[PDB]
Amino acid sequence: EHQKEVQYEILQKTIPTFEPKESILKKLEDIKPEQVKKQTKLFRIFEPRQLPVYRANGEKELRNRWYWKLKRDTLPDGDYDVREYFLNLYDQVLTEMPDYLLLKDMAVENKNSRDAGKVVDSETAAICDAIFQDEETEGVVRRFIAEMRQRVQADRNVVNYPSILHPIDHAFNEYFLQHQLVEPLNNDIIFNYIPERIRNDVNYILNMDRNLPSTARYIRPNLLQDRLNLHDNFESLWDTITTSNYILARSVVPDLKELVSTEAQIQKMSQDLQLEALTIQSETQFLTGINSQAANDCFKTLIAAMLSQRTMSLDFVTTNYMSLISGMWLLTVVPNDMFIRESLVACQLAIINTIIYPAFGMQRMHYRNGDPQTPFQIAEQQIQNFQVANWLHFVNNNQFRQVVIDGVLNQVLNDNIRNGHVVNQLMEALMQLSRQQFPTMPVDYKRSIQRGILLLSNRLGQLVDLTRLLAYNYETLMACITMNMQHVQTLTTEKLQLTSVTSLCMLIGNATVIPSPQTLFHYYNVNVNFHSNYNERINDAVAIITAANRLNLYQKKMKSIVEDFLKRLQIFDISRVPDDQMYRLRDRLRLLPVEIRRLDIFNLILMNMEQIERASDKIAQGVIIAYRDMQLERDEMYGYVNIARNLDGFQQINLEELMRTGDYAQITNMLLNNQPVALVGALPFITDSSVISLVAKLDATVFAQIVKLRKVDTLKPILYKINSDSNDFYLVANYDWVPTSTTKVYKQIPQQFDFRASMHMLTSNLTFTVYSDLLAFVSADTVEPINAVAFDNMRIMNEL
Amino acid sequence: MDVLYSLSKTLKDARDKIVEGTLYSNVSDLIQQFNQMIITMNGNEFQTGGIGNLPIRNWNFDFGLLGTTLLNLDANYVETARNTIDYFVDFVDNVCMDEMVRESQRNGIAPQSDSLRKLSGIKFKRINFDNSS
Amino acid sequence: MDVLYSLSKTLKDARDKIVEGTLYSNVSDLIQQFNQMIITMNGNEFQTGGIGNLPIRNWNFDFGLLGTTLLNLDANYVETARNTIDYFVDFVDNVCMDEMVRESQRNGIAPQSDSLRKLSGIKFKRINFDNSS
């Protein structure tokens, strides 16, 4: 069996299925719910600092106008690095995505002024107290700051607090308010988050106990469907899901009760069985035991299989005919549809041959299948005992009616009312058996065989009960599954020893068990979360990727995002994900919309992107060379400097392009025959005060470099912050003269500060109370098991 | 040329879908397109007229954009917008008229005016949109 | 008044773009607008007619919103929707007609009917959209 292993494993490496069985359950019950991220700070990007200003040719004018500047200005060097940088912001934005907000939780005293004032947040506060005192601020300012009082309306829950942010800041925080993604909450909604089914399942009691303030608030679960059809290619992963979903199931499936003492039955069994009667291959039909277990296993196992939309095989044992009979039970119910074609192969033929056909005297030509139409079915066309004949069509045609769309989008491949609790199928499965008692071969044969058959029949009164049981259970549990479920040929099986099967069968009494209330919920809850995570990450995923494209980040895109994606999903251990899989996964992802939320924000970042980049203190966009004595310009803030707010009149050379693609010296020639040229993108930076410098023409130096090193990182350019002061070098204005800068740069001037326009009002709701888990508010009991009912309404489990 | 077209459907679908009240998510796809324009324009100078009794009005660009934010639109939002539209309207009118009079034996199928010739430029193509007229 | 307008383009772009088989995302921007309406409405009651042979019918609102978890609509989705539209259609008809008969010398440029006068109210402005007609 060693040879079988190595290969049976080479396959398991193509399956992101975690190793141990159990190890998987935990991962689920564990998937906690998404943490809310209420929030404190208003959140900005820039506060306004004072700064020295020197009038044209002037000294520190003594005044210090207020300009906007970036808190945390960490910008890389190179257009490309810039684009990547912003991207991180997107990720940060999402991880901080405040689902909701309130202002009282940020209230602050507007220290100054007559009407008890409580402004927005700390920064808002500071600023006021600050300006209040910069004596050169229009009388209107103090006034406004003054009298402007908050806005408190007890009724309706309104709160409009005066605030001050910034155009790009209001921008953010705003939408965060207009997308509080928090819908109300009425007893009725809790009632409704319940499967349209359960409520109507008499056996279960419903009741309300706690009330609900108009303060009630929850967050949509978000249960979009599949979005991703993994059902038609990612086998490796389905197998891993099935498995998972499966274990999950077993964890739920109620344990059975009141069984017939193991010993008692097996003993009357030997009396009936006539075991040791010549036949050589003894004690293979009694390895049946451990039934007090086998049945429990066979039972659970069967359900999950179904629910989880798994497929399996059968630790079959040819000799042990009994074990076969019961097989017939299995097909009588479980829709063969979900049973790898093969295990059904063995089973049937084993029945067909070592049974029916000869003991029934018919085809004494025993039989011979290939691989298309089934031995259980074709046998029909060729059988003359109606009873026998109906079994055949019903068994071959009972296709797990793969067609359902309940309680709002829940394709849960269903099953026959017939089977359900019309049961008869069973009654007919029996009646057909009731006339299989006849000739062909040795005596110890019919004797032994038929006797076993009878044990199915008598018990049949009860076997009925079984049908009802499952009927309900599956039909119940199912209700609470959000994940859809297309029938698929899993790559992996699940062994089901006819041993246990057989036990369950003749071994179940007037027992009656069902899913504990609490149990059910727990189930819903899980799938729920999981879903939420899947859907959510999906959005998180998409959002990035798409951004990744317009943000010309022609690099990571492939794996990078995918890896993180799967990890967060928990369920599987990447690595063993074949490469055609991960990439194919992207191929599908890239073709979807984007949760307005996600999308809506990126659109915002891009519009202000430009503005930020030039807004920084370190780094400007490209430089110009003209080898033409040029007239240095003058700007109030930098004093006497060489800045250019506009390219136009000189070619543009995408540094990014050059660097990334190697150089052809186009630039090398232009520089050499010394021609007017420009360089674009983000770049290092250098300030200098050496009046002298300018005379030395330093700015025309730095450049030569590039060529030797084939690089262009080391391209710090130069600016001359020549203020009529901090420059010891001032033997300049003492001599008639004018600045001869051979070069200048693009860093556009920072923005002046205008109060008015930065002062925005704030629309915030007031006083919530966020609730999670939900359900809990549900009070529910249960009738006593001895009183159940299915669609039937007569009574499930009714053989007193 | 096609450029030109957009400029309008932009304004129409604008002076039309931007009213006191409407829900933002009806214009999200729109708003964007709009801004995109302002950008491409700002930093450009134009001139129309000069022929017969047609005035020679000059134009410059330098505009702020639009908050994207807000569930619904408040009156104030509109007025600050309408003020910007009216400059473009009064613009296009003058642009159309200026290219609606000149004729050329040679390429009477190509752009004429200093105003439009400049538009067919590549750097402006980033504005095209919804050609269903 | 403008209010009124919307009510229709809402329904048209509705009874039109909402059919058995279109991908959800082709109406995402739309669906929203719609719901928004239902909300603002429900609760308030109206009176139409009350002149000449025009019948006085009373309209009341009590409706559940629309989908949010769909991917290409299933027939069932439509029918449950069409049923809601038909009440609005038969409504508007009666609203139009009622204000299409009243005249006024002094101010015969404003709303006359009890039905419309109530619409110009502020609490409704939240609907206006796509003014291209």
Residue type, A735: Y
Pairing mode, if any, of strands A778-779 and A152-153? unpaired
Contact criterion met (CB below 8 Å) for A217 and A770: yes
B28 shares contact with chain C (CB less than 8 Å): yes
Determine the Cα–Cα distance for residues A357 and A378; give it in Å rounded to an integer: 13
Q: What residues in B contact C127, CB-CB < 8 Å?
A: 21-22
User: How distant, in Å, are the alpha carbons of A161, A579, A641 from that of A693?
Assistant: 53, 58, 13
- Least CB-CB distance to B16: which of C126, C127, C131? C131
Task: Give the contacts of A770 (CB within 8 A, at least 6 positions apart).
Answer: A36, A38, A100, A182, A217, A218, A219
A227 forms beta bridges with: none
> What kind and span of H or E run contains A162?
strand A158-162
The three state secondary structure string of A616-676 is: CCCCEECEEEEEEEEECEEECCCEEECECCCCCCCCEEEHHHHHHHCCCCHHHHHHHCCCC
| Interchain proximity B68–A603, CB inside 8 Å | yes
A122/A207 Cα distance (integer angstroms): 47
A561: amino acid identity, one letter: I
Q: Whole-angstrom Cα distance, residue A541 to residue A758?
A: 34
**Rounded CA separation B63/B41 (Å):** 9
Q: Please name the member of B32, B64, B70 whose beta carbon is closest to the beta carbon of A603.
A: B32
Question: Chain A: residue nearest C25 by CA?
Answer: A593
Q: How far does Cα A293 stand from its chain's mean position?
A: 37
CB pairs under 8 A between A and C: 14
B25 in contact with C, Cβ within 8 Å: yes
Label each residue of A763-798 as H, E or C. Answer: EECCCCCECCCCHHHEECCECCCCCCCCCCCCCCCC
The CA distance from C111 to the nearest CA of chain A, in Å, is 31
Give buried/exposed letters for A503-542 (b at 16+ CB in 10 A, else e): bbbbbbeebbbbbebeebbbbbbbbbbbbbbbbebbbbbb
Q: What would the DSSP string read from start to end of C95-121?
A: HHHHHSS---STTTTS--SHHHHTTSS
For residues B104 and B112, the answer to whether their CB atoms sit within 8 Å is yes
- Flag whether residue C35 sits within 8 Å of chain B, measured between CB atoms: no
For the packed helices A291-307 and A498-506, what is the interaxial angle rounded to 10 degrees?
Answer: 110
A550 class by beta-carbon count within 10 Å (0-12 exposed, 13-18 middle, 19+ buried): exposed
Amino acid at B117: R
Cα–Cα dist B21/C122, whole Å: 9
Neighbouring chains to C with at least 3 Cβ pairs closer than 8 Å? A, B
C-alpha distances (whole Å) from A222 to each of A27, A34, A207, A571, A772 are: 21, 12, 26, 19, 14
Asked if C33 has any chain B CB less than 8 Å from its own CB, the reply is yes
Record the tokens describing residue A551, joined without a space: 């943000």
Beta partners for residue C45, in sequence order: C60
Chain position carrying tokens 């490469």: A579
> Which of A182, A594, A603 is the mutation pick for testing B, counting most B CBs within 10 A?
A603
| Chains touching B (3+ CB pairs < 8 Å) | A, C
CB A79 within 8 A of CB A655: yes
| A175 vs B contacts (CB less than 8 Å) | 68-70
CB contact under 8 A, A224 and C69: yes
Q: In 3D, which of B22, B19, B21 has the Cα closest to residue B85?
A: B19
- Across the interface, do A170 and B70 touch by the CB < 8 Å criterion? no
Q: Which of A175, A600, A607 sits opposite B65 (nearest CB)?
A: A607
Q: Please state, in angstroms and as integers, the Cα–Cα distance from residue A690 to each residue in A624, A696, B99, following that order.
A: 20, 10, 54
Helix residue ranges per DSSP H, chain B: 2-17, 28-41, 75-99, 114-117
Please state, in angstroms and as integers, the Cα–Cα distance from residue A63 to each residue in A550, A726, B38, following that order. 44, 16, 35
Contact by Cβ (8 Å): C91, C57: no
Nearest to A174 among B43, B65, B70 (CB): B70
Whole-Å CA distances, A374 to A312, A336, A380: 17, 11, 10
Query: Helix %, strand %, coil % for chain B, to 5?
Result: 50, 5, 45
Query: Is residue B53 classed exposed, middle or buried when 0-12, 13-18 and 19+ CB atoms within 10 A define those classes?
Result: exposed
> Tokens at residue A40, please?
């404190």
Q: How far apart are CA A671 and CA A625, in angstroms?
A: 9
d(CA A128, CA A164): 9
Phi, psi angle pair for A46, to nearest 5°: -155, 135
> Cα angle vertex A573, ends A233, A575, to 5°?
75
The residues near A736 (Cβ < 8 Å, ≥ 6 apart) are none
Whether residue C36 and residue B21 make contact (CB cut-off 8 A), yes or no, is no
The closest alpha carbon to A598, from A656, A513, A538, belongs to A538
Q: Which residue of B has its CA nearest to C133?
A: B16
CA separation for the pair A632, A653 (Å, rounded): 24
SS3 A81: helix
C2 touches chain B (CB under 8 A): yes
| 3-state SS string for A275-311 | CCCCCCCCCCCCCCCCHHHHHHHHHHHHHHHHHCCCC
Q: Tell me, yes or no, if B16 comes closer than 8 A to chain C by beta carbon.
A: yes
Q: Choose among C25, C28, C69: nearest Cβ to A409.
A: C69
List all residues 6 or more positions away from A262 whose beta carbon is below 8 Å from its beta carbon. Answer: A289, A291, A292
Residues of chain C with Cβ-Cβ distance to B12 below 8 Å are 132
C74 contact residues in A (CB cutoff 8 A): 405
- Interface check for B55 against chain A (CB to CB < 8 A): the answer is no
Concatenated DSSP letters of A707-748: HHHT--SS-------B-SSS-S--TTTTSS---EEEEEE--P
Q: φ and ψ at A518, to 5 degrees?
A: -30, -45
Cβ(C124)–Cβ(C4) below 8 Å: no
Touching subunits of A (3+ CB pairs, under 8 Å) are B, C
Residue of A nearest to B35 (CA): A607
Angstrom distance (rounded) from CA A183 to CA A188: 13
Distance CA A19, CA A529 (A): 23
Tell me how close the Cα of B70 comes to any Cα of chain A, in angstroms. Answer: 6
Distance of CA A684 to the CA centre of its chain: 41
Mutation to test the C interface, candidates A188, A224, A403, A406, most C Cβ within 10 Å = A224
Mutate: best of B36, B39, B69, B80, partner A, most A CBs <10 A: B69
H-assigned helices in A55-179:
79-95, 122-132, 139-147, 167-178
Question: A444-467 b/e with 16+ CB inside 10 Å = b?
Answer: ebbebbeebbebbeebbebbbbbb
Method: cryo-EM
| Resolution of the coordinates, Å | 3.8
Residue in A closest to B38 by C-alpha: A607
